[PDB]
Amino acid sequence: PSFEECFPKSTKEHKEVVHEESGHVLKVPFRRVHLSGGEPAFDNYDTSGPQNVNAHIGLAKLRKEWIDRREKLGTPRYTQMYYAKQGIITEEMLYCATREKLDPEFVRSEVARGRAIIPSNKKHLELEPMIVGRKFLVKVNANIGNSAVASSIEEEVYKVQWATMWGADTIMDLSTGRHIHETREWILRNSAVPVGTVPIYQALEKVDGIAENLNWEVFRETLIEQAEQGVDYFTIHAGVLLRYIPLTAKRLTGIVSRGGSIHAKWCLAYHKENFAYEHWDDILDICNQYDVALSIGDGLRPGSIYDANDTAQFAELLTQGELTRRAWEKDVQVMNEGPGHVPMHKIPENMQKQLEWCNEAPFYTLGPLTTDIAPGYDHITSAIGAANIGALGTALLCYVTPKEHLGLPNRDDVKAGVIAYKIAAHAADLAKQHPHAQAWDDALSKARFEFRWMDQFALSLDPMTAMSFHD
Amino acid sequence: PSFEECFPKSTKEHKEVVHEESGHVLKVPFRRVHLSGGEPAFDNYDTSGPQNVNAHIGLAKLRKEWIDRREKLGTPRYTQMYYAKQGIITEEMLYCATREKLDPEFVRSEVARGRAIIPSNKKHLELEPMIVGRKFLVKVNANIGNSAVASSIEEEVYKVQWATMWGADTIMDLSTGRHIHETREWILRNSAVPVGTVPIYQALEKVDGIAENLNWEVFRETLIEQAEQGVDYFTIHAGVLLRYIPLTAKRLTGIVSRGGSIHAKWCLAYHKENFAYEHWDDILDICNQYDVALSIGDGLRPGSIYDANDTAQFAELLTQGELTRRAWEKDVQVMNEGPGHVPMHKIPENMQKQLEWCNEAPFYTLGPLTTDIAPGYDHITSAIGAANIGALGTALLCYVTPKEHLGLPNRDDVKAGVIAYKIAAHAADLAKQHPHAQAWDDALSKARFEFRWMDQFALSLDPMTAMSFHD
Ligand SMILES: O=P(O)(O)OC[C@H]1O[C@@H](n2ccnc2)[C@H](O)[C@@H]1O
Ligand SMILES: O=P(O)(O)OC[C@H]1O[C@@H](n2ccnc2)[C@H](O)[C@@H]1O
Ligand SMILES: [Fe+2]
Ligand SMILES: [Fe+2]
Numbered sequence: 001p002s003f004e005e006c007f008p009k010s011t012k013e014h015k016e017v018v019h020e021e022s023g024h025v026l027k028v029p030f031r032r033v034h035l036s037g038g039e040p041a042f043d044n045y046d047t048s049g050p051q052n053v054n055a056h057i058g059l060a061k062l063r064k065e066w067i068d069r070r071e072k073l074g075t076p077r078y079t080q081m082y083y084a085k086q087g088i089i090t091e092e093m094l095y096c097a098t099r100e101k102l103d104p105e106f107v108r109s110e111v112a113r114g115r116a117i118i119p120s121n122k123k124h125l126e127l128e129p130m131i132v133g134r135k136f137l138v139k140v141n142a143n144i145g146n147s148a149v150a151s152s153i154e155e156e157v158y159k160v161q162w163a164t165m166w167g168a169d170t171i172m173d174l175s176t177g178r179h180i181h182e183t184r185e186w187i188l189r190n191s192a193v194p195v196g197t198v199p200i201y202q203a204l205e206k207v208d209g210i211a212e213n214l215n216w217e218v219f220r221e222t223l224i225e226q227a228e229q230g231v232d233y234f235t236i237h238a239g240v241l242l243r244y245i246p247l248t249a250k251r252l253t254g255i256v257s258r259g260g261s262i263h264a265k266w267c268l269a270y271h272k273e274n275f276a277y278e279h280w281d282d283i284l285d286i287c288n289q290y291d292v293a294l295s296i297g298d299g300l301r302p303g304s305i306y307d308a309n310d311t312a313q314f315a316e317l318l319t320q321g322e323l324t325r326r327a328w329e330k331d332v333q334v335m336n337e338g339p340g341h342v343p344m345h346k347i348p349e350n351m352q353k354q355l356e357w358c359n360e361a362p363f364y365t366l367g368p369l370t371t372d373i374a375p376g377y378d379h380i381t382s383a384i385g386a387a388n389i390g391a392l393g394t395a396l397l398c399y400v401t402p403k404e405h406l407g408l409p410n411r412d413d414v415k416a417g418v419i420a421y422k423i424a425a426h427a428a429d430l431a432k433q434h435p436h437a438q439a440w441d442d443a444l445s446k447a448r449f450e451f452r453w454m455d456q457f458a459l460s461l462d463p464m465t466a467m468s469f470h471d
Numbered sequence: 472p473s474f475e476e477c478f479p480k481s482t483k484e485h486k487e488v489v490h491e492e493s494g495h496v497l498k499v500p501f502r503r504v505h506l507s508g509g510e511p512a513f514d515n516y517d518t519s520g521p522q523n524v525n526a527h528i529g530l531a532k533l534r535k536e537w538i539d540r541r542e543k544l545g546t547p548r549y550t551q552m553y554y555a556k557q558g559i560i561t562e563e564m565l566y567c568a569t570r571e572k573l574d575p576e577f578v579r580s581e582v583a584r585g586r587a588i589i590p591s592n593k594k595h596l597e598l599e600p601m602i603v604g605r606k607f608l609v610k611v612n613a614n615i616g617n618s619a620v621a622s623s624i625e626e627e628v629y630k631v632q633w634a635t636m637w638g639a640d641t642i643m644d645l646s647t648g649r650h651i652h653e654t655r656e657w658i659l660r661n662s663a664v665p666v667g668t669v670p671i672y673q674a675l676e677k678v679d680g681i682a683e684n685l686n687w688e689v690f691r692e693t694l695i696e697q698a699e700q701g702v703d704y705f706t707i708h709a710g711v712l713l714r715y716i717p718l719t720a721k722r723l724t725g726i727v728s729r730g731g732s733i734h735a736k737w738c739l740a741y742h743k744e745n746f747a748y749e750h751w752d753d754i755l756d757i758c759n760q761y762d763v764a765l766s767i768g769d770g771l772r773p774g775s776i777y778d779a780n781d782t783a784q785f786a787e788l789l790t791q792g793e794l795t796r797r798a799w800e801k802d803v804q805v806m807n808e809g810p811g812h813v814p815m816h817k818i819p820e821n822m823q824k825q826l827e828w829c830n831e832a833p834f835y836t837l838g839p840l841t842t843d844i845a846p847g848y849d850h851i852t853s854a855i856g857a858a859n860i861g862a863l864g865t866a867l868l869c870y871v872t873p874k875e876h877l878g879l880p881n882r883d884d885v886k887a888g889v890i891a892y893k894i895a896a897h898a899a900d901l902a903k904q905h906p907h908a909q910a911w912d913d914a915l916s917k918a919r920f921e922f923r924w925m926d927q928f929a930l931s932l933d934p935m936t937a938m939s940f941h942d
Contacts, residue, residue, distance in 0.1 A: 252913060253920045304916035305901065305909060341916075343909075344862050344902035370858065370898040372912035372919075374890065375927065376936035380851055381894055384858045387841065391815050405919065406940040419845065423852055427841040430776065431815035438776060438814075441843035442723060445775035445812075448843075448876065449724045456846065465847035469877040 003051050006165055008467075009034045009458035012046060017098050019091045022069055026091060027062075028098040029128055035447070035455045042443045042459060045099070045137065047164045049128060049192025055157040058189035061125035066091040078122055079291045082331035084112035092118050096131035101436065110135055114324070115360045116395075117333040119170070119194040119293040124230030128192045130169055132335060132362050134393040137434065138425035141196070141364070141398045142168035142418055145408075146175040146183040156183045157190045162411055164193050166418040167461070170396070172196040172235075180205060185229055194232035196295060199223055200259045200276075211265040216275040216282075223283065227290040235259065235337060236283065237297035238276040239319040242267045244300060247312035253303035260299020280323060284330040293333035295364055296320045301340040305372050308342040309349055321357040335362040335396065342368035342385060351392040362395035369400070378404035379420040386421060390428025397421050415462075422461055474522050477636055479938075480505045480929035483517060488569050490562045493540055497562060498533075499569040500599055506918070506926045513914045513930060516570070516608065518635045520599060520663025526628040529660035532596035537562040549593055550762045553802035555583035563589050567602035572907065581606055585795070586831045587866075588804040590641070590665040590764040595701030599663045601640055603806060603833050605864040608905065609896035612667070612835070612869045613639035613889055616879075617646040617654040627654045628661045633882055635664050637889040638932070641867070643667040643706075651676060656700055665703035667766060670694055671730045671747075682736040687746040687753075694754065698761040706730065706808060707754065708768035709747040710790040713738045715771060718783035724774035731770020751794060755801040764804035766835055767791045772811040776843050779813040780820055792828040806833040806867065813839035813856060822863040833866035840871070849875035850891040857892060861899025868892050886933075893932055 003012060011034065014027035031046040050059055070090075075082070083090050089104045093111065096118055097104040110116035116133025132139050142163035146156055160171055170193055173184050180202050188195055200214075203222040207213035223234065237259040245264050248255055255261050263274055276283065287294060300316040302308045320336045327334045336358050342350060347368070354363050367382030368389065374381050382400040390397060401409040401417035409417065429437040440459070447455035457466040474483060482505065485498035502517040521530055541561075546553070554561050560575045564582065567589055568575040581587035587604025603610050613634035617627055631642055641664055644655050651673050659666055671685075674693040678684035694705065708730040716735050719726055726732050734745055747754065758765060771787040773779045791807045798805045807829050813821060818839070825834050838853030839860065845852050853871040861868060872880040872888035880888065900908040911930070918926035928937040 253916050304920075305912040306916060344858065344898055345904065371894060371901060372916045373897055373930075374894050374932045375915075376931070376933055376940050377890060377894060380854055380891055381898070383851055384855050384895070384898055387815065387855045388859070403940055406937060407942075419848060420851055423842060423845050423848060424855070426844055427815055427852070427855055430842060433816065441776040444846075445724050445777060445843045449775075459844075460847070461845045462847055466877060469847050469874055471878075 003048060003165070006464065007031065007458070008463055009454065012048070012051065015098055017094060019094050021089070022066070022091065024065055024091055026095050026098065028095055033458050035452070035458070037450065037452055037455070039455065042440070044440065047167060047169055047193055049164055053190070055153045055186065055190050059126035059192060063091070063125045063127060067122045067125065077288045077331050079288060079331050079333055080111050080118045080120060081114070081328070081333050084108045085331060092120050092129040095129040100131060100136050107131060114328050114334065115362070117293050117335055117362055119196070119232035119333070121227065121230045121232045121290050121292050123228060123290060124188060124195065124232055126189060126192060127194060127232065130194065132395045134360070134362065134395050136395070138390045138394070138428045139169035139396045140167060140418065140421040140425050141170045141172060141396055142414065143172045143174050143398070144187070145173065146179055148177065150179070153186045156186050160187055160191045160193070163414055163418055166415050167422040168193065168418050170194040170196060172198070174198060174201065176201055176205060181225065188230045195230070196233040196235060197226055197231050198235040198259050198297070199226055200237065200262050202226070204262055211262050212269045214262070214266050216279045219275065220279070220282065223286050227286060227292050231292060233293040233295050235295045235297045236276050237263050237299035238274060238280055238323055239296060239316040240264055240267070240274055240299035241277060241319060242271065242273050244312055244315045247315055248300065251310065251312070252306035255300065256303025257297065257299040257301050259297050260301065263299055280326060284327055284332045287332045288330060291333070293335065294327055295335050295337055296323050298337040298339065301366070302342065304341050305343050308339065309346045313339065314353060317353055318357055321359065324358050324361045335364045338363050338365040338394070339368045340366060341372060342370065344370050344385070344388060347385065347388050348392065351389060351394065355393065363393065364396040364398065365389050365394050366398045367400055375405045376402055378402065379417050383420040383424045387424035387427045390424060391431035397425055419461055474519060474636070477935065478502065478929070479934055480925065483519070483522065486569055488565060490565050492560070493537070493562065495536055495562055497566050497569065499566055504929050506923070506929070508921065508923055508926070510926065513911070515911065518638060518640055518664055520635055524661070526624045526657065526661050530597035530663060534562070534596045534598060538593045538596065548759045548802050550759060550802050550804055551582050551589045551591060552585070552799070552804050555579045556802060563591050563600040566600040571602060571607050578602060585799050585805065586833070588764050588806055588833055590667070590703035590804070592698065592701045592703045592761050592763050594699060594761060595659060595666065595703055597660060597663060598665060598703065601665065603866045605831070605833065605866050607866070609861045609865070609899045610640035610867045611638060611889065611892040611896050612641045612643060612867055613885065614643045614645050614869070615658070616644065617650055619648065621650070624657045627657050631658055631662045631664070634885055634889055637886050638893040639664065639870070639889050641665040641667060643669070645669060645672065647672055647676060652696065659701045666701070667704040667706060668697055668702050669706040669730050669768070670697055671708065671733050673697070675733055682733050683740045685733070685737050687750045690746065691750070691753065694757050698757060698763050702763060704764040704766050706766045706768045707747050708734050708770035709745060709751055709794055710767060710787040711735055711738070711745055711770035712748060712790060713742065713744050715783055715786045718786055719771065722781065722783070723777035726771065727774025728768065728770040728772050730768050731772065734770055751797060755798055755803045758803045759801060762804070764806065765798055766806050766808055767794050769808040769810065772837070773813065775812050776814050779810065780817045784810065785824060788824055789828055792830065795829050795832045806835045809834050809836040809865070810839045811837060812843060813841065815841050815856070815859060818856065818859050819863065822860060822865065826864065834864065835867040835869065836860050836865050837869045838871055846876045847873055849873065850888050854891040854895045858895035858898045861895060862902035868896055890932055
């Protein structure tokens with residue numbers, strides 16, 4: 001369906017601002033919901049990106065002049081953190097500031113201090129910049145993966161188009177098997193939102209699924225390949241240390257992280273330290289040339305309520321903080337990945353320890369799921385946890401669909417997950433008293449009170465569901 | 472569908488215990504989930520009630536000998552609170568204690584002090600007793616209403632059967648229009664769970680929808696009619712005082728409570744104090760003869776995030792506490808109704824004030840909805856709030872379906888609402904570290920880890936959804 005079909009009475013708009021240092025004109029997307037009865041139109045965030053673009057051609061390379069100008073000026077490092085620490089407000093920073101209705105200097109400050117990141121690989125020229133950080137709107141990530149068999153470019157690109165239509169702020173391409181490189185190229189050239197990956201997945205594919213045949217060298221080659229395409233952030237499980245693995249022996253559900261499992265298998269096979277940890281500095285050198293942000297994985301994530309907040313989980317968290325501070329020494333942007341399965345009373349401890357041990361780097365959670373009892377409904381069990389941990393400061397929420405623990409999500413499942421997570425994210429924005437967040441609730445509630453039905457539906461997260469249910 | 476179809480590998484069971492004082496044998500329901508691989512069967516709560524019973528005959532009158540014996544002994548008041556304060560452990564108390572795996576004296580103590588209620592009108596002989604209170608499992612209420620046109624007894628009774636099959640602990644019959652008395656009779660004779668009502672709805676129908684023609688007398692007659700049938704609890708909006716009505720003038724969504732609106736209209740028409748407030752003592756006299764519990768309504772509930780925790784809402788809460796203490800002086804069981812629409816940061820204040828101002832009487836919330844932005848998904852927006860406020864001590868959660876704000880729920884909508892609320896309730900049980908609550912999560916997670924797929928599905932809230940999604 002088209003944008004207009006998904007969001008009746010809404011139009012795509014852009015706010016034009018000038019980047020003072022370069023003279024570059026930025027066109028920052030938003031949506032406008034047109035209302036009745038003398039109400040002013042309501043302006044809202046928009047991640048849906050350019051519409052009706054031929055996937056064989058790809059999106060406009062909107063960042064090209066920004067990247068070209070900085071290259072011509074010359075620079076030792078290419079990261080938003082490097083520029084921020086030099087006192088430079090970049091186009092990306094101004095774009096995010098405009099998008100967030102906040103001051104560009106505030107954005108620069110948050111990025112410089114490591115409390116926000118702008119995942120924006122210089123090779124992802126199609127990207128509409130966005131920011132992740134506790135001082136900003138809570139963001140949502142959706143995961144995609146290519147088809148088991150050969151699919152068309154239209155079919156692959158629709159996965160990003162659909163997730164972002166419903167509000168996904170980032171996506172990750174978690175493809176395995178064949179065609180990883182080719183389909184990721186299709187995604188990046190056609191994605192207006194940041195695209196992350198977990199590079200160890202493709203590295204494992206390069207060695208035919210034999211974890212014991214992994215090593216730094218094939219991982220390094222994989223990082224460069226993905227960076228060259230434009231991947232904006234890498235999940236890297238560098239905190240799964242050899243000595244932490246035995247801490248999982250008494251767990252109910254062991255190591256549930258896919259990347260964590262792979263590293264653990266390699267570590268145990270050789271009794272050697274995690275190669276991503278050992279080569280952390282070399283990873284930073286790669287990231288600095290492209291601006292790939294590092295999402296430090298939580299390979300020792302709890303996979304059951306029983307395992308929540310255990311010794312293994314927090315051992316890794318402590319190391320995530322060390323790795324964070326090391327990355328910042330080289331001006332590499334960082335966020336930290338978090339749980340997982342966590343009952344509600346254990347959520348505050350997670351945020352307290354992360355904020356302290358990781359120097360307020362942005363936190364990126366998978367839920368958490370607040371109970372294990374409802375497979376088929378884990379978008380709900382985890383929306384509860386995501387809203388809670390978002391309220392306490394978590395900056396990015398990885399979605400969970402109704403098919404979690406069960407199977408691959410179809411389009412209905414993906415939409416259900418994104419909607420549930422947009423609810424959690426906005427509920428968290430309200431809880432944080434984020435500026436102007438309540439204006440959205442107020443506009444819909446005013447429409448409800450005044451029986452402006454179409455306006456109520458048009459203002460909601462999913463207008464056609466509301467309208468259909470009413471009919 | 473049958474119990475077996477809804478819960479494959481589960482059997483309905485009963486734990487037999489003897490009430491020492493009377494010699495009465497109680498058969499307390501539970502379910503048993505039969506597992507594989509040498510796992511012991513897992514025993515869980517069961518509200519589904521007796522299966523395959525002809526609705527034209529009705530359920531067994533299991534409480535008859537209990538009520539008959541107490542009548543023969545003679546008593547001035549018939550409430551569980553009266554008996555508890557006399558030091559008597561009743562069959563109802565022992566039944567609830569067994570059902571909750573807690574001590575009968577503990578149950579008696581909680582009821583005597585007003586911190587738990589056992590809604591159990593002596594005329595509802597079909598009832599399998601249950602308890603509502605912060606020291607017990609968090610409970611869920613589902614609402615039903617009779618058909619707009621003439622429906623069969625099978626069709627009406629299926630509404631209760633369906634809601635309880637998925638875990639509803641109480642129901643309320645909120646029917647309006649024609650046939651209110653007749654269909655409520657069908658429900659009560661065929662309901663194993665407590666049945667509540669909002670008596671002002673039928674009182675309004677008796678005066679042909681003209682609120683100005685209400686008065687104490689027609690309300691009183693309605694209370695007696697409903698009590699005689701066996702209604703276990705009444706929502707009564709006695710805290711909507713005349714002087715509180717102007718406090719709503721600056722609200723965004725005014726008075727959203729149906730009962731509250733009716734009382735407000737009458738109060739404003741005559742400039743006279745709420746007649747349910749004025750006749751509170753007379754209401755208590757009725758309740759004492761049947762054991763009808765009072766659910767003190769929140770007619771000044773906030774209906775939008777904008778109105779949350781405002782002066783009007785808390786003025787009524789203060790009065791709810793006064794009414795609670797007055798009811799206890801006459802040994803009438805009480806719970807208090809709460810919000811509503813409340814953003815997450817405002818939830819703790821709601822619980823703090825209720826616990827203090829209402830002397831820890833059980834709290835009964837409608838959600839709360841944590842954001843207004845997602846009509847069509849208000850089971851999710853409110854599951855977040857319900858889980859949170861449940862974790863802080865709320866004892867009964869009134870469900871919200873995906874059709875909230877939009878239309879009448881079908882069977883799929885009702886199931887979705889009950890499931891979402893069972894998730895919230897159990898998540899709250901975990902957060903409170905309620906004894907043995909985590910054993911359920913652990914059993915499912917162990918099955919997951921060990922690839923015992925059927926066991927995983929059988930242990931879940933909705934086995935056939937999990938199984939189908941996996942397939
Ligand atoms: O390889 P593992 O299982 O750790 O990661 C799977 C996915 O989960 C996401 N995630 C987010 C927080 N913790 C894990 C991560 O970014 C990736 O999308
Ligand atoms: O008449 P009003 O709208 O107050 O009540 C509608 C329903 O909402 C329930 N409720 C629960 C808490 N507050 C309200 C109440 O028990 C009844 O089922
Ligand atoms: Fe999981
Ligand atoms: Fe509402």
